[PDB]
Design an enzyme around this catalytic site. Structure first.
Site, PDB file in Angstrom:
ATOM      1  N   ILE A  75      -4.397  -5.670   9.238  1.00  0.00           N
ATOM      2  CA  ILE A  75      -3.409  -4.792   8.637  1.00  0.00           C
ATOM      3  C   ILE A  75      -4.102  -4.204   7.409  1.00  0.00           C
ATOM      4  O   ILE A  75      -4.339  -4.889   6.418  1.00  0.00           O
ATOM      5  CB  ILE A  75      -2.094  -5.538   8.313  1.00  0.00           C
ATOM      6  CG1 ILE A  75      -1.407  -5.950   9.621  1.00  0.00           C
ATOM      7  CG2 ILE A  75      -1.137  -4.668   7.485  1.00  0.00           C
ATOM      8  CD1 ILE A  75      -0.369  -7.033   9.478  1.00  0.00           C
ATOM      9  N   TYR A  92       4.065 -12.480   5.545  1.00  0.00           N
ATOM     10  CA  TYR A  92       3.024 -11.921   4.662  1.00  0.00           C
ATOM     11  C   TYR A  92       2.724 -12.868   3.502  1.00  0.00           C
ATOM     12  O   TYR A  92       3.584 -13.131   2.654  1.00  0.00           O
ATOM     13  CB  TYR A  92       3.521 -10.546   4.214  1.00  0.00           C
ATOM     14  CG  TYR A  92       2.673  -9.698   3.303  1.00  0.00           C
ATOM     15  CD1 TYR A  92       1.321  -9.958   3.060  1.00  0.00           C
ATOM     16  CD2 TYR A  92       3.239  -8.576   2.711  1.00  0.00           C
ATOM     17  CE1 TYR A  92       0.583  -9.127   2.217  1.00  0.00           C
ATOM     18  CE2 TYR A  92       2.524  -7.758   1.872  1.00  0.00           C
ATOM     19  CZ  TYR A  92       1.209  -8.032   1.626  1.00  0.00           C
ATOM     20  OH  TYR A  92       0.546  -7.174   0.791  1.00  0.00           O
ATOM     21  N   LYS A 110       0.328 -12.051   8.200  1.00  0.00           N
ATOM     22  CA  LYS A 110      -0.581 -11.147   7.501  1.00  0.00           C
ATOM     23  C   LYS A 110      -1.121 -12.045   6.401  1.00  0.00           C
ATOM     24  O   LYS A 110      -0.460 -12.267   5.372  1.00  0.00           O
ATOM     25  CB  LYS A 110       0.134  -9.894   6.952  1.00  0.00           C
ATOM     26  CG  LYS A 110      -0.765  -8.944   6.159  1.00  0.00           C
ATOM     27  CD  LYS A 110      -0.015  -7.719   5.577  1.00  0.00           C
ATOM     28  CE  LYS A 110      -0.892  -6.881   4.641  1.00  0.00           C
ATOM     29  NZ  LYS A 110      -0.330  -5.653   3.964  1.00  0.00           N
ATOM     30  N   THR A 160       0.826  -1.228   0.000  1.00  0.00           N
ATOM     31  CA  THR A 160       0.000   0.000   0.000  1.00  0.00           C
ATOM     32  C   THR A 160       0.850   1.264   0.000  1.00  0.00           C
ATOM     33  O   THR A 160       0.507   2.266  -0.643  1.00  0.00           O
ATOM     34  CB  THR A 160      -0.908   0.013   1.247  1.00  0.00           C
ATOM     35  OG1 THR A 160      -1.626  -1.216   1.322  1.00  0.00           O
ATOM     36  CG2 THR A 160      -1.907   1.160   1.203  1.00  0.00           C
TER      37      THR A 160
HETATM   38  C1  LIG Z   1      -2.866  -5.933   1.313  1.00  0.00           C
HETATM   39  C2  LIG Z   1      -2.203  -4.770   2.118  1.00  0.00           C
HETATM   40  C3  LIG Z   1      -0.912  -5.026   2.970  1.00  0.00           C
HETATM   41  C4  LIG Z   1       0.254  -4.124   2.663  1.00  0.00           C
HETATM   42  O1  LIG Z   1       0.062  -3.101   1.978  1.00  0.00           O
HETATM   43  O2  LIG Z   1       1.429  -4.366   3.033  1.00  0.00           O
HETATM   44  C5  LIG Z   1      -3.043  -5.889  -0.238  1.00  0.00           C
HETATM   45  O3  LIG Z   1      -2.935  -6.983  -0.863  1.00  0.00           O
HETATM   46  O4  LIG Z   1      -3.317  -4.860  -0.931  1.00  0.00           O
END
Ligand SMILES: *[C@@H](CCC(=O)O)C(=O)O
Ligand SMILES: *[C@@H](CCC(=O)O)C(=O)O
Ligand SMILES: *[C@@H](CCC(=O)O)C(=O)O
Ligand SMILES: *[C@H](CCC(=O)O)C(=O)O
Lengths: 305, 305, 306, 305
Positions: A204, A137, A165, A51
């Site tokens: 998150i 993640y 995450k 993001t």
């Molecule tokens: C999740 C957001 C987590 C991040 O931005 O690190 C997405 O897949 O957009």
């Protein structure tokens, strides 16, 4: 102790990285955004996450942003540097320097694009986990590779493992949490149910950038299915083009960041911004510092590449 | 003229990047590998592609490798620098410098991981296409995003568009080639049929690193379903872990590169190497410079990270 | 206000950058060194100055070291990042990022090696001065170019001008200070007299790395010419090879940094270390955290750079 | 053999690095300049030397320029990359990559600014000499440190030692050459006598950028004291501000490079350009490709930094 505290955070924002007209970081806009996050119950930040366009940064500007965040806000919020990479040497270099400037933890994606074997993942993850506290993640829709349960059940025993995450859904989360693996949902539109019905510690979040106090409400206390329903259309609009396209457009529309994009991201179309303005107007009182929501004209946006 | 010549190449190898014990490039091994490729009918090289671990290089070593390849071999083979990126500025910087050192074309993947909108793809691809001749690389299994037909049908009109390196299959290729969009297959196990039955000019190959002369046979003259069938098990073994794990292991087993891996790649297991030795022994006379195939012991492999 | 406070600092240490066996920064050793500096009255640090081997760092490790220093110590000491360069774009990039991580000021050398004209110097210095508070660093024995008086008298009027780190001597300093130009001495063996007899606010010091409390004594209150005289032999030994060779050797000998050198620096010879051990032993109680002084053997030293 | 050939080159140009309006390299101007050098008897080039502003380049653009020069001109001229540094690791990294792209030799200055001991110099110089043929560059007026004779007499025995680029004068050169140490003069105004009376093989030249055929005349055949005298005023004007200020100004005045400077270099003053135009006009027929000689106005110059 630091591990135990970080594991209990329910609202972490994957903070947007705002830009000046020339494409460099806009630290005044960033600091105003972060202060509003903290006043609305946000307990931590991912700095330069997906993001936050970490993958569009050079490492020196990324470590600068992490360092700046620690110095200005590290006593008031958890600072989680997104220092992972598909290159193990790059991940180790960035993660070590991130901890050296005082970040509290790292976010560690599996190697995207340059996919590796199970043995490779265990090597990579053990190496970055040895550097300090880490959130792991999993987002196969982006990386091309799902981190399998066997890998997670092994690395979850590391003393620096904070949790997942997890982006593959609430069933995945429920299975992990039922076996003692701490999880944050990475999907805003699933996060309420992840938190309240599937054992997730929290979220998150992308949408928290815009409405941090409302995401705080969704993560604490009794289930709030009315709020969840009220945010459904906004949450879908936030992903109508791949994140962070909607977020970047939204913050510009709300007067909270300049309308500047690093390529390959470009803003939502005029028609999508019209739909968005209506959804943002419905929650305007919960957009901190927002004076008005403007649709904006196509010529206002600046693309840097 | 340069565009027209490059469009007709049938066998391009995505060349392996061999390493010294300390993890730096082993240029003597690289040069021996390239010479063996050229003597076996290979017409071009992708330098630092997926197979060549371009994503594990710093840009200065990558431009060095491209420059070195042009200077030593650019009169004998087409040199295609893999200078694409999920960052548009990074792609433009690398692609410009690559052309400045005399590479003949670029390979340009869509932004992996940091996925963008259709408008973003058109911006990104138009920008890199303006730098010089480009092959456009579609591999959604790795990137998390398929480059859609509508995008390809627009960018294929660019005067520097060479074609697709297409990995979604022979049906995709047949549809593109029937509409005048030049395609190379990116999948060795499909490449024979892509070439002979689906209009593909040929292959951008992994397995050619090991058996370049046999891949040459599959791309020229009459269909050779016997050879294609005889190579089926070997081709599957080359992808039993994600590429380039098998390739890196195979070249070490054949005495053609040192048993050195940059993380997050690690070698195949002992059991997988046993299966592989049998398959490699069956084609040993077609592995250039191979004196013998060794299974190897686990302790012989060196991991650098 | 920030400018006015920084202008009054009398003891700034050009902090040594200690290394692990593999040549990367040894932050535990660095932090122990800095804490001992601060407990002994040091009011500021040059991070990655000449003494700190800034010229042997990549920018990412240098900005990391500056950021780390700000975050761990920036409320207790002034943090001055040595972000200058002979390349104006490099200086501007590094200086901007340095201020963005919260450093209080920069140190700005004139372009060494790639020497420029007077007009070039004014352009370069005006550009870096616009980024934030700056000390201007003149050391022609290293750069090949003396920053002339006429340049200094022009750039000293910039609102971010903190003063000179002047290395051409006490006569140079006296002329500058008599005309209202704030100066720190860059030469330890001249610094007492610069401070007490030539109008210098104080010193940007090498030897303070080893004996910070004694350098503090030399900079504050009345003249202490006896202490200055007592430290003369040590101060000469600290420059018997070009700085920071003696410093790096000394801190290893005192157990305060690992015996690791980034090339092209290599340690003092065995014979020079023997002479040094005697001088260091005489002031051991003023070397914070020093448990013993060892001469050390040649095989203990590790050279990184290949 | 390569060593022996390189040792005999009498005219090497420390080639200027021309810039586009935005400060990036102007390779069309560079290539036109180099072709004119080669047609006028220049036998080699220092790429990114002091005169070429190597210290104002990032390494990736410098290796690009070296690689480009090898690929376009390496069969017609010796290509000597200025890959030295005051950091030994930086020197080794750049020098290795320079040789990997096919440069014939390096130029290796002693560590400027961060001056080291005699033992340090021997370590540094032995390390870079092990990479390939090297000219050793002594210019204490820039570095703050004279390379002493005892160092030179030790390293001159290395099989990759080509000689000194000596800037401390013809007496220094005479003493070195009388003891078997090959020398090029680094000072144009001394070079004729260095060559004809002091045993220097020839010159590594600034002024050759402007009048390569005249510098060729000074280095070959009989002494030409009339030409040497005729060039005295021009040679002094070329250093009235530190090199390459005059060179950069001169090439702009002659229409041979754009009036673009990377800071901290800025052009000569209007009055200095007036004096220069007269001196350049006197030798205009020996300035290859030279347009009119224009004094130029101050506003025409572009400073990038
Ligand atoms: C999740 C957001 C987590 C991040 O931005 O690190 C997405 O897949 O957009
Ligand atoms: C193409 C190889 C195809 C693959 O493994 O997906 C390349 O650039 O290596
Ligand atoms: C040598 C030229 C001599 C000088 O100006 O000191 C060079 O590499 O430019
Ligand atoms: C200042 C010290 C002065 C010197 O050794 O010339 C510094 O930045 O190290």
């Amino acid at each position: 102790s630091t591990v135990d505290r970080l594991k209990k955070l329910r609202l972490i924002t994957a903070i947007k990285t705002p830009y000046l007209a020339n494409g460099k970081f806009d630290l005044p806009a960033y600091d105003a955004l972060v202060s509003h996050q903290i006043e609305n119950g946000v307990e931590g930040l991912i700095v330069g996450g997906t993001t936050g366009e970490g993958h569009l940064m050079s490492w020196d500007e990324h470590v600068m942003l992490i360092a700046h965040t620690v110095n200005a806000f590290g006593d008031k919020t958890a600072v989680i540097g997104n220092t992972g990479s598909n290159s193990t040497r790059e991940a180790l270099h960035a993660t070590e320097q991130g901890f050296a400037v005082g970040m509290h933890a790292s976010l560690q994606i599996n190697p995207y694009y340059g996919k590796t074997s199970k043995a490779g993942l265990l090597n990579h993850f053990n190496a970055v986990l040895n550097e300090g506290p880490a959130v792991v993640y999993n987002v196969p829709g982006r990386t091309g590779q799902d981190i399998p349960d066997d890998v997670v059940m092994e690395i979850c025993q590391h003393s620096n493992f904070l949790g997942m995450k997890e982006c593959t859904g609430n069933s995945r989360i429920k299975n992990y949490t039922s076996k003692g693996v701490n999880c944050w949902s990475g999907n805003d539109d699933e996060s309420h149910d992840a938190r309240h019905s599937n054992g997730a510690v929290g979220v998150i979040s992308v949408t928290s950038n815009v409405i941090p106090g409302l995401m705080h409400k969704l993560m604490h206390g009794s289930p709030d299915p009315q709020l969840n329903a009220d945010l459904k259309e906004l949450m879908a609009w936030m992903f109508c083009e791949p994140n962070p396209i909607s977020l970047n457009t939204a913050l510009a529309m709300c007067g909270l960041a300049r309308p500047v994009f690093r390529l390959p991201y470009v803003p939502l179309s005029r028609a999508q911004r019209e739909k968005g303005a209506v959804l943002l107007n419905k929650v305007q009182e919960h957009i901190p510092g927002c004076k008005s929501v403007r649709v904006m004209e196509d010529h206002e946006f600046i693309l840097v590449g």
